[PDB]
Design an enzyme around this catalytic site. Structure first.
Site, PDB file in Angstrom:
ATOM      1  N   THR E   1      46.377  48.815  46.477  1.00 38.42           N
ATOM      2  CA  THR E   1      45.584  47.594  46.427  1.00 38.42           C
ATOM      3  C   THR E   1      44.116  47.911  46.201  1.00 38.42           C
ATOM      4  O   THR E   1      43.491  48.590  47.011  1.00 38.42           O
ATOM      5  CB  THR E   1      45.723  46.778  47.716  1.00 38.42           C
ATOM      6  OG1 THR E   1      47.098  46.438  47.919  1.00 38.42           O
ATOM      7  CG2 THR E   1      44.902  45.506  47.624  1.00 38.42           C
ATOM      8  N   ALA E  49      49.771  39.799  52.140  1.00 32.80           N
ATOM      9  CA  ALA E  49      49.945  39.015  50.924  1.00 32.80           C
ATOM     10  C   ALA E  49      50.208  37.551  51.240  1.00 32.80           C
ATOM     11  O   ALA E  49      49.605  36.663  50.628  1.00 32.80           O
ATOM     12  CB  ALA E  49      51.083  39.592  50.086  1.00 32.80           C
TER      13      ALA E  49
END
EC number: 3.4.25.1
Lengths: 228, 199, 204, 238, 201, 239, 250, 232, 213
Positions: E1, E49
């Site tokens: 990420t 998420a």
């Protein structure tokens, strides 16, 4: 002179909601027409003084990007219903990723149209017209303070609501076009109002499947008056 | 973790701060502002928990602005400091404990200048100078050394130079740029940004 | 401990017709002092004081809650408060927070509002009263303060030697303590006047 | 007249007039007729129009896969009991994983409408529910009232001039057991046509038919698939 | 990420990777991490998420109602303030959210940074993620306020490439958005395997 | 707990209590207010001091924030609840979204508060009608008004109190943009308009302006004598 | 259920209130009080409505209710309707001190009570207060202050005041004999003896029928003074001496 | 209940409270009583008539103690008296749980009337129909207080409530004086009770309680029969 | 103590076709080292164009299925229509987040046709995030099935390999081959392979046996 708010008539109807329909009669008039090409809509502002700012008095109020409104009756009582109908469409999109349909908006509105009481107030005093375009094409609905919800092809309400509906049945058919229905509506408006038609007395709102929003800035308004 | 200082004068309050907004190991923002103008003669820094520093300064800001807007005049710095100690001590014994560490710096029209102190256990202390952070362990000796109760503000800035050059000599931190205010009879005045060049 | 977070010491001592009370001046956090003017003795009417020691949060909190209930009492009644009445008032206020307790140990000294009769008492952190006739002590350095007053107190003492006894009791006990010091203030009150002195102690 | 105000106040004759006024509110709605065979249950409704441009107000509404109801009277009391009706069906569907039998569901309605007919400041529900559905033992036709006296009937009609609708039923009630759906339905809409003036009957804008059957989920037709049922009719004599 | 965002003369550039993992296992390669809120606002994803997907969707609910009541689009500092207050009510319950807020405002460009720890700071350049520290160094070496549009594209494009090359959890494809005054516009979406042949020579 | 409705419908289709409380607004003192393009102005009339008593407590012009100014009619006590409520809401708006409060936002808060205060049970309505004047960000001066029904409503000039329609009829023949050109002419416009109000001998006229970049500045009782002097000088040119 | 309600919330058909006007006329009967300041110090005049010779008078305090170390009040109306208000207003002034550790200014204390008295008139149909009362006090911002209170929740700043219906004629005297900052505290006291001489129809102004309480500013103490019955009598004999002196011109 | 909570007592157009004035009429039709404070203790005396020869006298009591130094009598209606006794019994205990000290006599009358005044303003109840007389020798000097259904309270040297309360009011003004003793006060308290009683006065026709600085004490019918010598 | 979670097994596969959708699952319901049954399909026909699969803790699978079946009926009585495929996936995300601090332990895959007659596959997580993919595999054997369909369906890591669209018949033998290889190495992969095929004409079911060890 003080009877129940929740009591049937001896004839059998009701007491207070019958008076609520009478309260619509002292409001300004409005005309909305559903066409196969879109939904046009009209209202009179009823200007009192030239000191008064004209655009601070609105009758067409957007609910969603593709759903308009039209009110006649007590003003700030309608402002309660507008704020709820905006929210309950946003609860629909942020839980389903789709737009709430034009019929299913008014189902949520007319639930608390008659929920007045002590536990768990008075009934409301405004009648509404809901136009909009959804998957079943353009639609037009009409409600009342008595919660009676119905679909109309071209409904006209307000103070001159009786003479409007009589003249409208003469000039309406199913195969209308958009601009034909627009100029036919204001002919009915200038017959039922008392002042001269200008850029300040009325306003329009036209939603289309193509032109997806209702978009009626001024001096388009003067363009239609000079063409009639 | 971050450093503040509280030099109090005869008719002025000299406060300074830092501009570093820290992170894990990196330095995200290097022009942060810890200061909060409560009124025209009362300032408020804040040091503590990274979520708690913002909202309690915002909560104390509006409740003091209610007092000026309703009654038509400003709180004293004494009554302002004792309103803050009430709100931390009340909600201390609660499911949401509060963790910030900051004083006040105020000038009264009658009582003159004033400086307070606050812990996260909400204790007040009228003080002639104070500090927070780990730099207090390396600067409360100098500020105790070169102090005079009748000091002038030109010496006080020079005393603040002596307090700050020992910071970037024996630290494990960076702390490049330091913002400075000054409060007098005329209100809030912003002095220049005290910095240290790299090259 | 939680009591040893800020430290402190409060001593009261009964004399012949007068009473004396004293405390230290240091405000600190576990190794590091901040100031030397932290008030721990608060007046509750005339010829009647109260001292607080322990956690400095509950020192400033209880002294304002007690002042809250005191002004309501002296306006519903016309008279002042009796010293037994205040001891029952403080013991109520600590027992309400039975399970979330305040971390303080009060010491009450004062005279009769009718005669010259003195009164001393001290309480627990949950509110058990305890009246004596010679002295009461509170704080972190408790055991050093018992060694003084058991070896220096005499029953019938003029206000001069009462001042000299409570001075030598504090200066020898607090200097033996580590986290308490930085000056001692002494209140000695009597029927006609109130005398407040500050002693010359070791500032280390 | 002074004792004819609240629901709580009894009469000196012993008749609470507020319920008797709510019976008049049912008689103002449009007529509807429900009936059943041995193996099927069909209810037929009649719509009205507020104006020519306005659409017709709908009468029959789907509740569950076998239960569907008709309506008469108010519209607020319609949807308020409807939301209670749909709620109770899916609860036993969630708990017991089975459809409710029709009989004990209606007993929940009489308990529901009982409380606002006894306490102060609460109107009765002006409503005219005709109920059709299957339990495990065949079709059922139920009717209600604002006095909450549910009736296990075989053919009834409620609303405006249902007086004439009932009279057609008993002179053909013996035929209502052996005949199948094609003439069972058009037996029913021969009863609606005497609740009318003598110059309009059923012209594909004002009639709706709901059928529940053995191998048939409750299905509502309206004005376009009703047209196969509306053929094969004799006119009214004179 | 790995995400980054920076503002300059011609608006704001936002770039991110597309890999979401699960421990040592890769769940997918085509995760759209830059959450599109409005035609005039953009949000990112960091850590949790479903936490970033829920609350930014809930943030878009309040901004739409605000526009209908006030007949005006919301400001960038307003939306960052509403998001900081909603996440603070669940402080200490274990939410993972370190997103960024981007958009044009009446006061010019807008760039803020909201954590699940109550942090709300403004600034000029940011980089969020497990491989965020690999993006600060290459960007600050190449950053200037007076850059061109084609120059700012290639700076943010290689900066994501240098992060995914070093980091294990970052990878996939490089999405690239441009926030302008009229509104945001998608620039491109490039694969890392195609960029490797570009920056080899 | 008070489960009793106060305001219900009438047989002609109206409410009693809303058109029953507007007479209390009509029995209050007058206060007018116009807007220019840079400097707004509003002036109360009918001070009616007792000539030996205090006057800083009978203030009829206050402020909710550093942008928004108040002026009302009706009875005194009902305004105090509305004003001290609205000071909280405009300050709590800044605890949220960090902008200063727009003048249209605070009028919707007051009108929605006053509407449900008539919709509910066992509650008298308010008997006030406020004037809300502010010059927000972008510097656009505008004013609004309220009503005991709760209808926020934007004007360009307003007149309330005992003699509202007469002053509104005076402004009705006074639509000149030239009076909104000079600031002191606009202040003299209000002073000429308040001269049409009850006696107005230069002593019962308390006016206050706001130059859109500053808090409300009340003119001293020497410019009131100065502006009434030049209004008398401008009236002398009628020959 | 519904026919037993009294409807003390609806306006009048004239377009005004209907129940508060009934309440405000009870204040004019059963009580007469006033207060006057023009310089350092402020007085309060009381009147014994019941002066029967079998009372104890062992309270040693009266209608003057010392509600603070800087303020007190003089009440007239329903008697124990005040005891709800005096205990409530005493605690509002005390919870302010808990919050700030600073004494309450005299202005915003009055606003705290007037919001309570209005709240019964706004909603509920609760019976409103039949209580009007006065205020005296010192602060850091304006010094000595007077305030009138109303059952409607209305107040105002004053320098000479009135409660009783008999004191409506005292307002005509207070317009005639008032000054602008010349309150030596014998001129203010001889004026108050002069007012209650003419207004109170009890002849010769017996010292037991009236009561005077003053508030003077000390160094930091704000001494509230309830003066005893001996010095009332010499003040009456002082005023009787001035009446015999002034009639020599006739 | 439902939540009606509306007060049934409102103002008159004249500006008076009508139901409170009607409740005082029920007090004036009550049994006569008297109370005298004379310089060392307070003497209370009531007028207890059994309507028949079948009633028991040692069952129902009139002079009622509250603390060991506080007594209390009444003149009004019987059942409403027993409500605010049990209220005042409990209310004296929360002073003693907090302050660990016997409650002063002025302190109850602050609190008992605050119960009684708020009870009139509250919704859906009538006021009480009982006036009280409260006695006690707290801190040397004894006290004698009188409340009423209007919520007010006073402080009397000597007073009388019940029937013919204005006739005994003129009697106490002439017969009593500044100072007496406890024994002289009982002699004149029976003398004003004999003013309005029936023919025979025995140990059961009247019932007398006293205060001392030694404490509140209720007299037994033996000594009342013994004090009945030299009657009135 | 009382631990409220346990793992049961199962493996779900979905493939978004051009005009179809194939959902496959095994029928073994195991716990610990034992077999409860050999007949327990994970396919659930929600509408005529939507099939959901549910793996993980079986007690949450029975609960979460019955919640969705109620809200389908609550949609239809309120909106006079049926839900789409994407509307169900948007609704399910709020349901999974609604128990954020006491989560379900359920891996969800929704397959079915869109409003244009194309295959749509939505994968999920036990907290509520979702996306639209061409093929996903969830359950115990999820790691043994994802990289193979990357080679076959995704056409990744192959040089000079054309991109032919996957037909219906080629997709059938791709499903039948991967569960044979999964049953060899996984111990949770069972015996009967229920395969549901959603076309524009209805839903077809098909059962293929595997090894019984």
């Amino acid at each position: 002179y003080d009877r129940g708010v929740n009591t049937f008539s001896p004839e059998g109807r009701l007491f207070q909601v019958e008076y609520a329909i009478e309260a619509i009669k002292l409001g300004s008039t409005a005309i909305g027409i559903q066409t196969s090409e879109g939904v046009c809509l009209a209202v009179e502002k009823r200007i009192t003084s030239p000191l008064m700012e004209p655009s601070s008095i609105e009758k067409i109020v957007e609910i969603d990007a593709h759903i308009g409104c039209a009110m006649s009756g007590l003003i700030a009582d309608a402002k309660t219903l507008i704020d709820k109908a905006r929210v309950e469409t946003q609860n629909h999109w942020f839980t389903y990723n789709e737009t709430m349909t034009v019929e299913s908006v008014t189902q949520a509105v007319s639930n608390l149209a008659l929920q007045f009481g002590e536990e768990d107030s008075r009934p409301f005093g405004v009648a509404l017209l809901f136009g909009g375009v959804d998957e079943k094409g353009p639609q037009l609905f009409h409600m009342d303070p008595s919660g009676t919800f119905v679909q109309c092809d071209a409904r006209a309400i307000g103070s001159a609501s009786e003479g409007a509906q009589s003249s409208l049945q003469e000039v309406y058919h199913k195969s209308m076009t958009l601009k034909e229905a627009i100029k036919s509506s204001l002919i009915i408006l200038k017959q039922v109002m008392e002042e001269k038609l200008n850029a300040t007395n009325i306003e329009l709102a036209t939603v289309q499947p193509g032109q997806n929003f209702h978009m009626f800035t001024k001096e388009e308004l003067e363009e239609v008056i000079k063409d009639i | 973790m971050e450093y503040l200082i509280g030099i109090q004068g005869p008719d002025y309050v000299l406060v300074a701060s830092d501009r570093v907004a820290a992170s894990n190991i990196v330095q995200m923002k290097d022009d942060h502002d810890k200061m909060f103008k409560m009124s025209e003669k009362i300032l408020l820094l804040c040091v503590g928990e990274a979520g708690d520093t913002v909202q309690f300064a915002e909560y104390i800001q509006k409740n003091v602005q209610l007092y000026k807007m309703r009654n038509g005049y400003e709180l004293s710095p004494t009554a302002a400091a004792n309103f803050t100690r009430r709100n931390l001590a009340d909600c201390l014994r609660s499911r949401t404990p509060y963790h910030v560490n900051l004083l006040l710096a105020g000038y009264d029209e009658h009582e003159g200048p004033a400086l307070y102190y606050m812990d996260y256990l909400a204790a007040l202390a009228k003080a002639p100078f104070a500090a927070h952070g780990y730099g207090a362990f390396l600067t409360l000796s100098i500020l105790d050394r070169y102090y005079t109760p009748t000091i002038s503000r030109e010496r006080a800035v020079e005393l603040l130079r002596k307090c700050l050059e020992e910071l970037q000599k024996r630290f494990i931190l960076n702390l490049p740029t330091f913002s400075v205010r000054i409060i007098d009879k005329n209100g809030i005045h912003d002095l220049d940004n005290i910095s240290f060049p790299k090259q | 401990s939680i009591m040893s977070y800020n430290g402190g010491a409060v001593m009261a001592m009964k004399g012949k017709n007068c009473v004396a009370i004293a405390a230290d001046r240091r405000f600190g956090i576990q190794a590091q002092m901040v100031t030397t003017d932290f008030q721990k003795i608060f007046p509750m009417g005339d010829r009647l004081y109260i001292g607080l020691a322990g956690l400095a949060t509950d020192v400033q909190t209880v002294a304002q809650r007690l002042k809250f209930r005191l002004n309501l009492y002296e306006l519903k009644e016309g008279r002042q408060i009796k010293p037994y009445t205040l001891m029952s008032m403080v013991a109520n206020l600590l027992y309400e927070k039975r399970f979330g307790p305040y971390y303080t140990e009060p010491v009450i000294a004062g005279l009769d509002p009718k005669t010259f009769k003195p009164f001393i008492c001290s309480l627990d952190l949950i509110g058990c009263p305890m009246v004596t006739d010679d002295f009461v002590v509170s704080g972190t350095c408790a055991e050093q303060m018992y060694g003084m007053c058991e070896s220096l107190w005499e029953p019938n003492m003029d206000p001069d030697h009462l001042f000299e006894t409570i001075s030598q009791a504090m200066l020898n006990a607090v200097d033996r303590d580590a986290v308490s010091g930085m000056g001692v203030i002494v209140h000695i009150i009597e029927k006609d006047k109130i005398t407040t002195r500050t002693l010359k102690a070791r500032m280390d | 007249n002074q004792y004819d105000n609240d629901v709580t106040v009894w009469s000196p004759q012993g008749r609470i007039h507020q319920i008797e006024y709510a019976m008049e509110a049912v008689k103002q709605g449009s007529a509807t007729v429900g009936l059943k065979s041995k193996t099927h249950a069909v209810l037929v409704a009649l719509k009205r129009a507020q104006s020519e441009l306005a659409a017709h107000q709908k009468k029959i509404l789907h509740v569950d896969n076998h239960i569907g109801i008709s309506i008469a009277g108010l519209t607020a009391d319609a949807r308020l009991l409807c939301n209670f009706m749909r709620q109770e069906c899916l609860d036993s569907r969630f708990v017991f994983d089975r459809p409710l039998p029709v009989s004990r569901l209606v007993s929940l309605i009489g308990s529901k409408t009982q409380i606002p007919t006894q306490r102060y400041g609460r109107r009765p529900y002006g409503v005219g529910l005709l109920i059709a559905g299957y339990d495990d033992m065949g079709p059922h036709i139920f009717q209600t009232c604002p006095s909450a006296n549910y009736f296990d009937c075989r053919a009834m009609s409620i609303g405006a001039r249902s007086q004439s609708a009932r009279t057609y039923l008993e002179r053909h009630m013996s035929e209502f057991m052996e005949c199948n759906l094609n003439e069972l339905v058009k037996h029913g809409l021969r009863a609606l046509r005497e609740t009318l003036p003598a110059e309009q009957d059923l012209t594909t804008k004002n009639v709706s038919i709901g059928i529940v059957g053995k191998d048939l989920e409750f299905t509502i037709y309206d004005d376009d698939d009703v047209s196969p049922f509306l053929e094969g009719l004799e006119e009214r004599p004179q | 990420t790995t995400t980054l965002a920076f503002k300059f003369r011609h608006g704001v550039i936002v770039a991110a990777d597309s890999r979401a993992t699960a421990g040592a296992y890769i769940a997918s390669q085509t995760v759209k991490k830059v959450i599109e809120i409005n035609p005039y606002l953009l949000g990112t994803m960091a850590g949790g998420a479903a936490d970033c997907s829920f609350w930014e969707r809930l943030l878009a609910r309040q901004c739409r109602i605000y526009e209908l009541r006030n007949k005006e689009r919301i400001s960038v500092a307003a939306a960052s303030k509403l998001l900081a207050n909603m996440v603070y009510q669940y402080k200490g319950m274990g939410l993972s959210m370190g997103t960024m807020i981007c958009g044009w405002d009446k006061r010019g460009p807008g760039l803020y940074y909201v954590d699940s720890e109550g942090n709300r700071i403004s600034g000029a350049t940011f980089s969020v993620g497990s491989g965020s520290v690999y993006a600060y160094g290459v960007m600050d070496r190449g950053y200037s306020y007076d850059l061109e549009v084609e120059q700012a594209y290639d700076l943010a494009r290689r900066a994501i490439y240098q992060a995914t090359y070093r980091d294990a959890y970052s990878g996939g494809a490089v999405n690239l958005y441009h926030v302008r005054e009229d509104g945001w516009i998608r620039v491109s979406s490039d694969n890392v395997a195609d960029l490797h042949e570009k920056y080899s020579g | 707990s008070y489960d009793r409705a106060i305001t219900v419908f009438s047989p002609d289709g109206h409410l009693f209590q809303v058109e029953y409380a507007q007479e209390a607004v009509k029995k209050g003192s007058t206060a007018v207010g116009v807007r220019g393009r840079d400097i707004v102005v509003l002036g109360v009339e009918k001070k009616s001091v007792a000539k030996l008593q205090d006057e800083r407590t009978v203030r009829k012009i206050c402020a909710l924030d550093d942008n928004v100014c108040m002026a009302f009619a009706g009875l005194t006590a009902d305004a105090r609840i509305v004003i001290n409520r609205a000071r909280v809401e405009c300050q709590s708006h800044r605890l949220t979204v960090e902008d200063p409060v727009t003048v249209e936002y605070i009028t919707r808060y007051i009108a929605s508060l006053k509407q449900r205060y008539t919709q509910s049970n066992g509650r008298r309505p308010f008997g006030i009608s406020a004037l809300i004047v502010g010059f927000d960000f972008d510097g656009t001066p505008r004013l609004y008004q309220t009503d005991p029904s709760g209808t926020y409503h934007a004007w360009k000039a307003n007149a309330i109190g005992r003699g509202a329609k007469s002053v509104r009829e005076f402004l009705e023949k006074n639509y000149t943009d030239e009076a909104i050109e000079t600031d002191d002419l606009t202040i003299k416009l209000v002073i000429k308009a308040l001269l049409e109000v009850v006696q107005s001998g230069g002593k019962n006229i308390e006016l206050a302006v706001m130059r859109r970049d500053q808090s409300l500045k009340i003119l001293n009782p020497e410019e009131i004598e100065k502006y009434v002097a030049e209004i008398e000088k401008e009236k002398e040119e009628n020959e | 259920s519904r026919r037993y309600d009294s409807r003390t919330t609806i306006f009048s058909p004239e377009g005004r209130l209907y129940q508060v006007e009934y309440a405000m006329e009870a204040i004019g009967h059963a009580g007469t009080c006033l207060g006057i300041l023009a310089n350092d110090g402020v007085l309060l005049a009381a009147e014994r409505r019941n002066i029967h010779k079998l009372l104890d008078e062992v309270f040693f305090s009266e209608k003057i209710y010392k509600l603070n170390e800087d303020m007190a009040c003089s009440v007239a109306g329903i008697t124990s309707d005040a005891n709800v208000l005096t205990n409530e207003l005493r605690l509002i002034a005390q919870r302010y001190l808990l919050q700030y550790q600073e004494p309450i200014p005299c202005e915003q204390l009055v606003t705290a009570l007037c919001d309570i008295k209005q709240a019964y008139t706004q909603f509920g149909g609760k019976r409103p207060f039949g209580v009007s009362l006065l205020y005296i006090g010192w602060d850091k911002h304006y010094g000595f202050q007077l305030y009138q209170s109303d059952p409607s929740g209305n107040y105002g700043g004053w320098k000479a005041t009135c409660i009783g219906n008999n004191s409506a004629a005292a307002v005509s005297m207070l317009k005639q004999d008032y000054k602008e900052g010349e309150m030596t505290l014998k001129s203010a006291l001889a004026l108050a003896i002069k007012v209650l001489n003419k207004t109170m129809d009890v002849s010769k102004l017996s010292a037991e029928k009236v009561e005077i309480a003053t508030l003077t500013r000390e160094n930091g103490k704000t001494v509230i003074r309830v003066l005893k019955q001996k010095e009332v009598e010499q003040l009456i004999k002082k005023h009787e001496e001035e009446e015999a002196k002034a009639e020599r011109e006739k | 209940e439902r939540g009606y909570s509306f007060s049934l007592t409102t103002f008159s157009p004249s500006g008076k409270l009508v139901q409170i004035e009607y409740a005082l009429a029920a007090v004036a039709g009550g049994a006569p009583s008297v109370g005298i404070k004379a310089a060392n203790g307070v003497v209370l005396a009531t007028e207890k008539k059994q309507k028949s020869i079948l009633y028991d006298e040692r069952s129902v009591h009139k002079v009622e103690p509250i603390t060991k130094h506080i007594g209390l009598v009444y003149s009004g209606m019987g059942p409403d008296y027993r409500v605010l006794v049990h209220r005042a019994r409990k209310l004296a205990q929360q002073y003693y749980l907090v302050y660990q000290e016997p409650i002063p006599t002025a302190q109850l009358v602050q609190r008992v009337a605050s119960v009684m005044q708020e009870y009139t303003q509250s919704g859906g109840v009538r006021p009480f129909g009982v006036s009280l007389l409260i006695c006690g020798w707290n801190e040397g000097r004894p006290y004698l207080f009188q409340s009423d259904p209007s919520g007010a309270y006073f402080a009397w040297k000597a007073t009388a409530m019940g029937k013919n309360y204005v006739n005994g009011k003129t009697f106490l003004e002439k017969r009593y004086n500044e100072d007496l003793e406890l024994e002289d006060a009982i002699h004149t308290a029976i003398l004003t009770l004999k003013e309005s009683f029936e023919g025979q006065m025995t140990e059961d026709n009247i019932e007398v309680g006293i205060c001392n600085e030694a404490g509140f004490r209720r007299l037994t019918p033996t000594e009342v029969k013994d004090y009945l010598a030299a009657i009135a | 103590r009382f631990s409220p979670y346990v793992f049961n097994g199962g493996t779900i596969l979905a493939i978004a076709g051009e005009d179809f959708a194939i959902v496959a699952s095994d029928t073994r319901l195991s716990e610990g080292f034992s077999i409860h049954t050999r007949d327990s399909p994970k396919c659930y026909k929600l509408t005529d164009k939507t099939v959901i699969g549910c793996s993980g803790f079986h007690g949450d699978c029975l609960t979460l299925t019955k919640i969705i079946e109620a809200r389908l009926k609550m949609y239809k009585h309120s909106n006079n229509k049926a839900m789409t495929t994407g509307a169900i996936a948007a609704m399910l995300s709020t349901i999974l987040y609604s128990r954020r601090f006491f989560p379900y332990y359920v891996y969800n895959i929704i397959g079915g046709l869109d409003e244009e007659g194309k295959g749509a596959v939505y994968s999920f997580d036990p907290v509520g995030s979702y996306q639209r993919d061409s093929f996903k595999a969830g359950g115990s054997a999820s790691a043994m099935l994802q990289p193979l369909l990357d080679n076959q369906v995704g056409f990744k890591n192959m040089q000079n390999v054309e991109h032919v669209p996957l037909s219906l018949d080629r997709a059938m033998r791709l499903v039948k081959d991967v569960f044979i290889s999964a049953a060899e190495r996984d111990v949770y992969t069972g015996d009967a392979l229920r395969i549901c095929i959603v076309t524009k004409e209805g839903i077809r079911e098909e059962t293929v046996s595997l090894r019984k060890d």
